[PDB]
Amino acid sequence: EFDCHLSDMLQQLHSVNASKPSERGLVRQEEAEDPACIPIFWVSKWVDYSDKYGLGYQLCDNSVGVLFNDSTRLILYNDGDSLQYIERDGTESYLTVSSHPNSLMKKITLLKYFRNYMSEHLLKAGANITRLPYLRTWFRTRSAIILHLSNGSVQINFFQDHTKLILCPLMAAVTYIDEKRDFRTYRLSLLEEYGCCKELASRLRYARTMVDKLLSSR
Ligand SMILES: O=C(O)[C@@H]1C[C@@H](O)N(c2ccc(F)cc2F)C1
């Protein structure tokens, strides 16, 4: 089953949640940190225009992408000129804006509209910290937006309090961005051992459920 690491992520989340890390008593959350699992990629900005066009987003490396409603993806690298186009069937090709390709004129123009909106009206998430993936799929609930990247990472942005989770199954790690914009990366195995606060635990339970929904909609 090639489900872009979701089954692994779900396994990792079941085990930690099953351990009931908020009940430990003697809780030592700091001992579960591991800055060697700090993620390289996450979504720093997003704009949902899914009624008409698609979902536009910026990655922390300043590349921008769009997942169109026709289920193709266009990625503009941070050089502002190199494009990666992912067709319906997963087939990838590379081009440049400057070659002014008839084929992708409309989709490039849209990506540029998204790009400019984000630069003028949105703030960069994770800004206070230092292969290029595309957005595989996303959905939103009343409480959050869930973004699944092609590298297996799942990001969950909670609207309410602006907290964010970035789950990386390759490292069996989770990064938590709290309301104060503080940024902490944990090994899930070590959260099972040392435990955590009710807040992070609750969001990890929520994450399991969101990963289930992603797996249920392939
Ligand atoms: O006709 C136009 O110029 C397009 C249509 C509008 O939805 N566009 C748009 C789409 C997404 C944005 F973030 C900003 C925009 F201006 C521009």
From Swiss-Prot:
Subcellular location as annotated: Nucleus; Chromosome, Centromere, Kinetochore; Cytoplasm, Cytoskeleton, Microtubule organizing center, Centrosome; Cytoplasm, Cytoskeleton, Spindle
Protein family per UniProt: Belongs to the protein kinase superfamily. Ser/Thr protein kinase family. CDC5/Polo subfamily.
UniProt-recorded name of the protein: Serine/threonine-protein kinase PLK1
Outcome when changing W46F: Abolishes interaction with CDC25C and reduces centrosomal localization
Record domain POLO box: where: 42-120, 134-216
Associated disease: Defects in PLK1 are associated with some cancers, such as gastric, thyroid or B-cell lymphomas. Expression is cancer increased in tumor tissues with a poor prognosis, suggesting a role in malignant transformations and carcinogenesis.
Positions of modified residues (Phosphothreonine): T130
Annotated TM spans: none
UniProt remark on domains: The POLO box domains act as phosphopeptide-binding module that recognizes and binds serine-[phosphothreonine/phosphoserine]-(proline/X) motifs. PLK1 recognizes and binds docking proteins that are already phosphorylated on these motifs, and then phosphorylates them. PLK1 can also create its own docking sites by mediating phosphorylation of serine-[phosphothreonine/phosphoserine]-(proline/X) motifs subsequently recognized by the POLO box domains.
Assembly and binders: Interacts with CEP170. Interacts with EVI5. Interacts with FAM29A. Interacts with SLX4/BTBD12. Interacts with TTDN1. Interacts (via POLO-box domain) with the phosphorylated form of BUB1, CDC25C and CENPU. Interacts with KIF2A. Interacts with CYLD. Part of an astrin (SPAG5)-kinastrin (SKAP) complex containing KNSTRN, SPAG5, PLK1, DYNLL1 and SGO2. Interacts with BIRC6/bruce. Interacts with CDK1-phosphorylated FRY; this interaction occurs in mitotic cells, but not in interphase cells. FRY interaction facilitates AURKA-mediated PLK1 phosphorylation.
Stretches the record annotates as Important for interaction with phosphorylated proteins: 162-164
Up-regulation conditions: By growth-stimulating agents.
Gene coding for it: PLK1
Tissue-level expression: Placenta and colon.
Placement of covalent cross-link Glycyl lysine isopeptide (Lys-Gly) (interchain with G-Cter in ubiquitin): K124
Residue list for modification Phosphoserine: S7, S82
Species name: Homo sapiens (Human)
Processing and modification events after translation: Ubiquitinated by the anaphase promoting complex/cyclosome (APC/C) in anaphase and following DNA damage, leading to its degradation by the proteasome. Ubiquitination is mediated via its interaction with FZR1/CDH1. Ubiquitination and subsequent degradation prevents entry into mitosis and is essential to maintain an efficient G2 DNA damage checkpoint.
Covered residues, full protein: 371 to 594 of 603
